[PDB]
Write a protein that binds this ligand. Structure first.
Ligand SMILES: CCCCCNC(=O)c1ccc(S(N)(=O)=O)cc1
Ligand SMILES: [Zn+2]
Length: 258
């Protein structure tokens, strides 16, 4: 209303309605693997998704969100750089028109085909709307996708996309296990940043996994058949819904691994 990813409403325009777009702790950023310092004081992440309760999948005109029941402490993220308990509320992806672009974070300027964002809020703030107003209010676990072998645990998501083609469509999406989207290693980089879509709030501890997951060309092709537009409107394929890397400014990216 009315930001997006086109020439006329894309990331270069966002600052006019969201001046924080040019702030001191914007996301995503380039992760320079030769400058990120190993921090032996960081903990192992704790990803506790055994009791995750998925509910619904929604095309919101910018991406699709798989939404979770976050009414109590079911699926949580703890440890690593975090203090306290962060509840999973939704996940979504950003992806490209072609395999050579699509991720938001980059690694030594490398763009991956896509990036998964598992979004969690700090339960010391009571609700999500209060958490986004706090510098430590969110933790977003970011996972790179490369194209290769299919990811079996992604197939249930790609199979429902046909039913939520256009903006505002949703579908029942219960009993989905987000553990099937994780890579084997939980080695990560961490830095303080922001939501990567308007309102671009500076409320996120970013935790970006080093190990990408592999998805097949057919899987990511099915992402690219979604529409940014509503039913009956001229078709605009949902592709290139990523914000480019933003200035690092006065921030250090820390590595969990040597
Ligand atoms: C209550 C404020 C409404 C904000 C609506 N926006 C989000 O809840 C949001 C979540 C995650 C990300 S991301 N791409 O950085 O993971 C971006 C935006
Ligand atoms: Zn995102």
């Amino acid at each position: 209303h009315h930001w997006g990813y086109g020439k006329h409403n894309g990331p270069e325009h966002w600052h006019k309605d969201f001046p924080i777009a040019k702030g001191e702790r914007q996301s995503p950023v380039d992760i320079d693997t030769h400058t990120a310092k190993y921090d032996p004081s960081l903990k192992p992440l704790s990803v506790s998704y055994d009791q995750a309760t998925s509910l619904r999948i929604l095309n919101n005109g910018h991406a699709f969100n798989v939404e979770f029941d976050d009414s109590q402490d079911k699926a949580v993220l703890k440890g690593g750089p975090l203090d306290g308990t962060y509840r999973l509320i939704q996940f979504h992806f950003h992806w490209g028109s072609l395999d050579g672009q699509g991720s938001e974070h980059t690694v030594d300027k490398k763009k991956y085909a896509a990036e998964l964002h598992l979004v969690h809020w700090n339960t010391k703030y009571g609700d999500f709307g209060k958490a986004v107003q706090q510098p430590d209010g969110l933790a977003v676990l970011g996972i790179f996708l490369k194209v290769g072998s299919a990811k079996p645990g992604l197939q249930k998501v790609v199979d429902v996309l046909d039913s939520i083609k256009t903006k505002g469509k949703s579908a029942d999406f219960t009993n989905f296990d987000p553990r099937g989207l994780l890579p084997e290693s939980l080695d990560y980089w961490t830095y303080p940043g922001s939501l990567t879509t308007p309102p671009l709030l500076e409320c996120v501890t970013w935790i970006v996994l080093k190990e990408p997951i592999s998805v097949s060309s057919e899987q990511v092709l099915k992402f690219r058949k979604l529409n940014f537009n509503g039913e009956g409107e001229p078709e605009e394929l949902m592709v290139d819904n990523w914000r480019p890397a933003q200035p690092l400014k006065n921030r250090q990216i820390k590595a969990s691994f040597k």
